[PDB]
Amino acid sequence: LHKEPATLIKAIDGDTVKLMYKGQPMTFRLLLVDTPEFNEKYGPEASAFTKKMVENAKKIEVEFDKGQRTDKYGRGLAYAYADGKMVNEALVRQGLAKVAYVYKGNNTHEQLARKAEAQAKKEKLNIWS
Ligand X SMILES: Cc1cn([C@H]2C[C@H](OP(=O)(O)O)[C@@H](COP(=O)(O)O)O2)c(=O)[nH]c1=O
CA distances from 16 to 10, 35, 123 (A): 10, 9, 26
**Cα 7 to Cα 42: distance, rounded to the nearest angstrom:** 26
Active site residue 75: yes
Site for Ca ion in 27-56 (CB under 5 A): 34-35
34 has binding-site annotation: yes
The nearer residue to Ca ion, 14 or 93, going by C-beta atoms, is: 14
**Residue 77 sits in the site that holds ligand X (CB under 6 A):** yes
Cβ distance 25 to 18 under 8 Å? yes
Cβ distance 80 to 60 under 8 Å? yes
The nearer residue to ligand X, 31 or 62, going by C-beta atoms, is: 31
**Residue 101 sits in the site that holds ligand X (CB under 6 A):** yes
**By rule CB under 6 A, what string of x and - marks binding of each residue 40-59 to ligand X?**
--------------------
Which helix (H) or strand (E) element contains residue 8? strand 3-11
Which helix (H) or strand (E) element contains residue 4? strand 3-11
Query: Which of the listed partners (ligand X, Ca ion, none) does 6 bind, with a CB threshold of 5 to 8 Å by partner kind?
Result: none
Stretch that binds Ca ion, among 3-11, 26-34, 39-47, 72-80 (CB under 5 A): 26-34
Which among 58, 60, 72, 66 is positioned nearest to 29, based on CA atoms? 72
Binding site for ligand X (CB under 6 A): 29, 31, 34, 71-72, 77, 101, 103
Question: Which residues are known binding-site members?
Answer: 15, 34-35
Q: Report, as residue numbers or ranges, the catalytic residues.
A: 29, 37, 75
